[PDB]
């Protein structure tokens, strides 16, 4: 178990080059101590010991030289070596490696073994001091033995004696007249004189080829005797490759059972199917049924049987089916291989059929068989994800990989999109001009990706958008229960036309381009992560607000992420904005490489036009999802981030996450540092709409608003202070000039706001002579160094401005060693008065006086606790009225002719968005505690924090645990609303009348929540989620290619243009059917131009001429891989045609099923070799694999390709299956060379890969460390 009980909550300190550990108590630690799972030791002075042994109790414990952690070592004790484990026990009969990477083996007495030894059946050598010889020869006994580099085990090896290679075996004896290897893995042959042989050699009646170096060449084809010869993969022995290796002659399969097992009918009646095609788990209606295994009786429509009882795609599958069903008690357990004769396999299928009919009679059911078939099917690579090339790079990380659907009118016309499906039309690639680069958008994200490039689908997205912005009017005839603005989810993963469609809709219906008051009545945001999206959005007129990741990113590097090494606060300034960082001169740099922060705040007087934006520190999807899961992983609750977790599992993890977040130590493993300081900056910045995350205010798990966070009071104060004081111009500075700090420099950031009409440091009074400014403005000081101590001389200054000369200021918020104090009003806080120039001066030590109460002492000291790791001071002017409001109302006048919607100014800055949900909330324990019920009772609270818009979670009904194939995502099983089946169901009752809330409550709860926010003068934001939809219940057959997030075919995939069963069709009787397209006709009549205006990506306008009441594949770009297999849709290998039964004039079935004679096997004729598949058809223009694993290609004429004498064996193949195109090497018996070198008629050597294709223009490596190069023309330079 444990040598010492663990301790937590104490910091490590370093004194005089040594680590000390100080307890939670504040006590220095001596002796052996398990601290946070690591066993460590401190001597009597309290210093930590590293790379030395210490004696505690009966244990001799070594501690590591880097970490000081207890680990195994060997100590020379008195005269002798003795091994020790991590717990300090002398080891017996065990290997141990010491500090220097040497290995000993200690015996029963603890004494190391010396000399030659056999251990666990391994021969090893030890030097006279007991050390293990590794990676060298050694003359023990008469003999000479080589010992392996890591194991130290005896192995054959070669060395160069004099000038000639010699071979040494495992026993240390030289090798004479035999094959022997070397450590690398090369085989040589050594003659009677000991000397290695070269070239072509015949020994023991067999011929081997040794190259110039003497290496035995296996799986090597070439013309050695002026006649072809292929050298074996097993032993390298030469075969003439004249003998055919296929073991299956042409045989007829028809017999007495064929007419009985044939299909009753060739159509959808007698065959289970998808769009006419058949699947591996298809059941069919045979003409007759061998009831009970005795008597054949005509079948009744309900007597369905599995196709795999009677037919198989190939012999391998047949043999596997037989072996699998056998193991389940259905007959003699059989070891069948593809090599087993076809007659034998078919006979064995029938004894299994008989047994099947017996267990059907015995059980009076077929469900046991459904489960047996289903299980067997998943076993086969062609019918599972093994042929789907699961990958996790990029967005594939979420669900394991994507399939892009194709326009294929010949095979899958229902699924044809009518030449739509333009992928990756993100803002920067809206016109496809970056399709060949990484600037093509990652169109595929999650689930079923909707084709937003299709005009018809674009119209439907507008219908949905109308439905949300009139939700209340339509669903409750309540014109006060309507959403006011939107958030556009996943901007970079959809067609950017949607932004224009949304923008123009808002223009038409609300005149958002007419005034700031109209625009700001419908606050709308974008989830737009690309670093070039801000500038796009601004070119297109800011119809929705861009995020400002530049500021969120800098919070990450300078405050929020990591215990120690953080970027300086200097980086917030982006001094590069000005030429030569001339803060003195302030000349703007007109021509920089598109870099830096979106809005400069060094001296922002409102004089330069800037891009309007929202900003945040954290989000429901930023710094939440990963930490919450890392916490679960760290405590063994789940293994992987994509792992499925239950709600209970989430709750347990959440308890650790909370413990870490509130940790008094001040260290955070999963959670973010300095959130209060980050909000202090977020909430005082000019030219932004800040957004506040629910999960920084309340705890992210459990019930909605169940418990506030420790940050709540500080952030609540900042929010109320923002209403009272935050207006006017801004400045921002740091006691720093770059990455590195000079002697006095603290790297403390100073951010100031001046008051309503005050735009600069030196401005003394407003132009309009308003006095509002005097009691407004704010001062913020922040640091990222919890070990910050000022020099005695040093002074830190807030330039509150020449509009605030001689004024008294009081603290709103001040940090200290146990927390951050919050001062709710002037009387309770320390005051400090500004000088003649308007500066508040601060020293290492300060003596502040309260306005009436007392004298206060306060040090400018970095602190470390749960609320901060650094410094935070905020100061406000005393004398602020109780109802003082510094905000600017938005003006109804047409201020701008620029065409733009949003404008960054004091009015827009007066808004605050509250993102009011967390993805990790628990499900409501009762209807009364549902989020939207709570929001209604609590609307008041947010009015007083200055929230002007409430961003509600997506209200769409969760797809839940439903999972038709593939990886489920956390959105779905956590019911957060981002994963949904029905876009229009926002919590309606079941059709039987029973309640059916979402995670957030019923549809009435939502309308009440929205109204309540309007009664308190707040807007409601709808989450618009056009990228995807989950768990569609209806199957269709699509043509699919395996693709990465950008829709580019994976480099090494056979999955190209294959038929696949996907879940793409909606129920048709859901709320998408009720409300789909219903509002478009009214909209076209009222606002024609929306439907006549051309969209950029398509050159076309949106098309409301077709309505979408039911989703189906034709409106989709693709899906995450569904784990069904590349050939779950059944196909004949010979002709490559897929089976179908939809229309009687174009039926294709295996011939057995139509009571015709199916012949199968290889048959020679005067012209060449032919092959017939199990379904009875001739192989033409296709690759075919025999029962022994050999591959062949059959040409257009139906003949196996084979090399002729004196002619080039390399052939260029062009097939119906395009992926297989390439240069192949076929032997005289037609076998394809794979994973090996092949000589042409002229002596040039080429290499052919795992699948037989020639490899060109690359270096190729070998298991024995041999390197070769292949030229562009294919030849091997080597
Ligand atoms: Ca997409």
TrEMBL record:
Belongs to the glycosyl hydrolase 70 family. One of its GO terms (molecular function) is dextransucrase activity. Keywords: Calcium, Glycosyltransferase, Metal-binding, Repeat, Signal, Transferase. Its EC number is 2.4.1.5. GO terms for biological process: glucan biosynthetic process. It is an enzyme of class 2 (transferase). Cell wall-binding repeats lie at residues 29-48, 1180-1200. Production of extracellular glucans, that are thought to play a key role in the development of the dental plaque because of their ability to adhere to smooth surfaces and mediate the aggregation of bacterial cells and food debris. It catalyses: [(1->6)-alpha-D-glucosyl](n) + sucrose = [(1->6)-alpha-D-glucosyl](n+1) + D-fructose. Residues 408-436 are annotated as: Disordered. It comes from the Bacteria. This is dextransucrase. The chain holds residues 147 to 1424 of 2057 of the full protein. Ca(2+) binds at residues 443, 449, 493, 1027.
């Amino acid at each position: 178990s444990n040598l010492s009980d663990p301790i937590t909550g104490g910091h490590y300190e370093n004194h005089n080059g040594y680590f000390v550990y100080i307890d939670a108590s504040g006590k220095q630690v001596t002796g052996l101590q398990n601290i946070d799972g690591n066993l460590q030791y401190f001597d009597d002075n309290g210093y930590q010991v590293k790379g030395s042994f210490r004696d505690v109790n009966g244990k001799h414990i070594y501690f590591d030289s880097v970490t000081g952690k207890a680990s195994s070592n060997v100590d020379i004790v008195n005269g002798k070596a003795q091994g020790y484990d991590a717990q300090g026990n002398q080891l017996k009969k065990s290997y141990v490696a010491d500090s220097s990477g040497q290995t000993y083996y200690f015996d029963g007495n603890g004494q190391p073994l010396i000399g030659l030894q056999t251990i666990d059946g391994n021969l090893q050598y030890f030097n006279q001091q007991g050390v293990q010889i590794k990676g060298g020869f050694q003359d023990v006994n008469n003999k000479r033995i080589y010992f392996a580099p890591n194991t130290g085990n005896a192995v054959a090896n070669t060395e160069i004696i004099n000038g000639k290679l010699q071979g040494r075996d495992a026993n240390g004896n030289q090798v004479k007249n035999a094959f022997s290897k070397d450590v690398a893995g090369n085989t040589f042959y050594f003659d009677a004189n000991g000397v290695m042989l070269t070239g072509l050699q015949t020994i023991s009646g067999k011929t081997y080829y040794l190259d110039e170096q003497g290496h035995l060449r296996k799986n090597y084809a070439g013309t050695f005797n002026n006649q072809f010869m292929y050298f074996d993969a097993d032993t390298g022995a030469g075969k003439t490759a004249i003998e055919y290796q296929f073991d299956q002659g042409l045989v007829s399969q028809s017999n007495e059972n064929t007419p009985h097992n044939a299909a009753k009918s060739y159509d959808k009646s007698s065959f289970e199917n998808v769009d006419g095609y058949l699947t591996a788990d298809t059941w069919y209606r045979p003409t007759d049924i061998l009831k009970n295994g005795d008597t054949w009786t005509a079948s009744t429509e309900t007597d369905m049987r599995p196709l795999l009882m009677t037919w198989w795609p190939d012999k391998q599958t047949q043999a596997n089916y037989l072996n699998f069903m056998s193991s389940k008690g259905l007959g003699i357990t059989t070891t069948y291989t593809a090599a087993t004769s076809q007659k034998t396999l078919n006979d064995a299928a029938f004894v299994i059929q008989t047994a099947i009919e017996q267990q059907i009679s015995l059980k009076k059911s077929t469900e046991w068989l459904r489960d047996a078939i289903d299980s067997f099917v998943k076993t086969q690579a062609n019918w599972n994800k093994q042929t789907e090339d699961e990958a996790f790079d990029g967005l594939q990380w979420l669900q394991g990989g994507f399939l892009a659907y194709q326009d294929d009118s010949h095979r899958t016309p229902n699924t044809d999109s009518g030449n739509n499906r333009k992928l990756g039309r993100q803002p920067i690639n809206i016109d496809g001009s970056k399709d060949t680069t990484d600037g093509k958008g990652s169109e595929f994200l999650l689930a079923n990706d909707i084709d937003n490039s299709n005009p018809i689908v674009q119209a439907e997205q507008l219908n949905w958008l109308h439905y949300l912005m009139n939700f209340g009017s339509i669903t409750g005839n309540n014109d006060n229960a309507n959403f006011d603005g939107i958030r556009v989810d996943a901007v970079d993963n959809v067609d950017a036309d949607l932004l224009k469609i949304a923008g123009d809709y808002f223009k038409a219906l609300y005149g958002t381009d007419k005034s700031d008051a109209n625009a700001n009545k419908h606050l709308s945001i974008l989830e737009d992560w690309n670093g070039k999206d801000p500038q796009y959005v601004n070119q297109q007129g800011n119809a929705q607000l861009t995020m400002d990741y530049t500021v969120t990113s800098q919070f990450g590097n300078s405050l929020t992420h990591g215990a120690n090494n953080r970027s300086n606060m200097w980086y917030f300034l982006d001094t590069g904005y000005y030429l030569n960082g001339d803060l003195n001169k302030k000349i703007v740099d007109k021509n920089r490489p598109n870099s830096g922060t979106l809005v400069n705040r060094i001296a922002n007087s409102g004089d330069t036009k800037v891009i309007p934006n929202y900003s945040f520190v954290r989000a429901h999807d930023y710094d939440a999802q990963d930490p919450i899961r890392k916490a679960m992983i760290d405590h063994g609750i789940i293994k992987n981030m994509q792992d499925t977790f239950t709600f209970d599992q989430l709750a347990q993890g959440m308890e650790f996450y909370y413990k870490d977040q509130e940790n008094p130590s001040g260290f955070k493993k999963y959670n973010d540092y300095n959130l209060p300081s980050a909000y202090a900056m977020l909430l005082t910045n000019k030219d932004t709409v800040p957004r506040v995350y629910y999960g920084d205010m309340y705890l992210e798990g459990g019930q909605y608003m169940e418990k506030g966070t420790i940050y709540n009071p500080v952030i609540s104060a900042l929010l109320k202070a923002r209403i009272k004081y935050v207006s006017g111009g801004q400045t921002m500075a740091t006691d720093s000039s770059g990455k590195d700090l000079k002697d006095g420099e603290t790297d403390l950031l100073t951010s100031v706001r001046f008051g309503k009409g005050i735009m600069t440091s030196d401005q003394t009074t407003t132009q309009d002579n308003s006095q509002d400014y005097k009691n407004q403005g704010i001062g913020v000081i922040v640091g990222n160094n919890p070990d910050l101590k000022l020099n005695n001389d040093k002074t830190i200054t807030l330039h509150m401005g020449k509009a605030h000369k001689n004024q008294l200021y009081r603290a709103l918020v001040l940090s200290n060693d146990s927390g951050i104090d919050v001062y709710d009003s002037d009387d309770k806080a320390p005051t400090l008065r500004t000088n003649d120039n308007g500066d508040l001066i601060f020293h290492k030590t300060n003596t502040f006086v309260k306005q009436d109460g007392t004298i206060i002492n306060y040090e400018m000291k970095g602190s470390l606790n749960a609320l901060i790791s650094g410094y935070l001071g905020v100061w406000v002017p005393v004398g602020a009225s109780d109802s003082q409001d510094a905000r600017t109302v938005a003006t109804e006048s047409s201020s701008s002719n620029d065409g733009s919607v949003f404008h960054s100014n004091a009015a827009l800055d007066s808004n605050v968005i509250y993102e009011g949900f967390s993805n990790f909330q628990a499900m409501p324990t009762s209807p009364e505690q549902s989020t939207n019920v709570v929001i209604a009772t609590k609307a008041n609270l947010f009015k007083e924090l200055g929230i002007t818009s409430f961003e509600l979670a997506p209200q769409y009904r969760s797809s839940g645990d439903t999972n038709y194939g593939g990886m489920s995502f956390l959105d779905s099983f956590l019911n957060n609303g981002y994963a949904f089946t029905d876009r229009y169901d926002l919590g309606f009752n079941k059709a039987d009348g029973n309640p059916n809330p979402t995670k957030y409550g019923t549809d009435q709860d939502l309308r009440n929540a929205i109204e309540a926010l309007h009664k308190n003068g707040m807007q409601a934001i709808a989450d618009w989620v056009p990228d995807q939809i989950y768990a569609l219940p209806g199957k269709e057959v699509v043509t699919a290619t395996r693709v990465d997030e950008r829709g580019n075919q994976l480099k090494d995939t056979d999955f190209v243009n294959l038929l696949y069963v996907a879940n793409t069709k909606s129920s048709g009787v859901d709320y998408q059917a009720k409300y789909g397209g219903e509002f478009l006709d009214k909209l076209r009549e009222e606002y024609p131009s929306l439907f006549k205006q051309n969209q950029v990506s398509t050159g076309q306008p949106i098309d409301a001429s077709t309505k979408i009441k039911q989703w189906s594949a034709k409106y989709m770009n693709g899906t995450n891989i569904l784990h069904r297999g590349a050939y779950y849709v059944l196909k004949d290998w010979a002709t490559n045609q897929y089976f179908n039964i939809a229309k009687t004039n174009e039926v294709f079935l295996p011939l057995q099923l139509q009571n015709k004679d199916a012949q199968t096997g290889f048959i020679s004729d005067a012209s060449g070799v032919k092959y017939y598949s199990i379904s009875g058809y001739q192989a033409k223009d296709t690759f075919i694999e025999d029962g022994n694993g050999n591959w062949y290609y059959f040409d257009k004429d139906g003949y196996m390709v084979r090399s002729q004498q004196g002619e080039n064996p390399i052939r260029t193949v062009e097939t119906s299956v395009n992926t297989r195109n390439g240069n192949y090497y076929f032997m005289p018996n037609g076998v394809e060379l794979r994973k090996g070198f092949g000589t042409d008629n002229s002596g040039n050597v080429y290499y052919f890969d795992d699948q037989g294709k020639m490899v060109r223009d690359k270096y190729i490596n070998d298991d024995a460390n041999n390197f070769y190069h292949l030229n562009v023309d294919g030849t091997m330079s080597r």
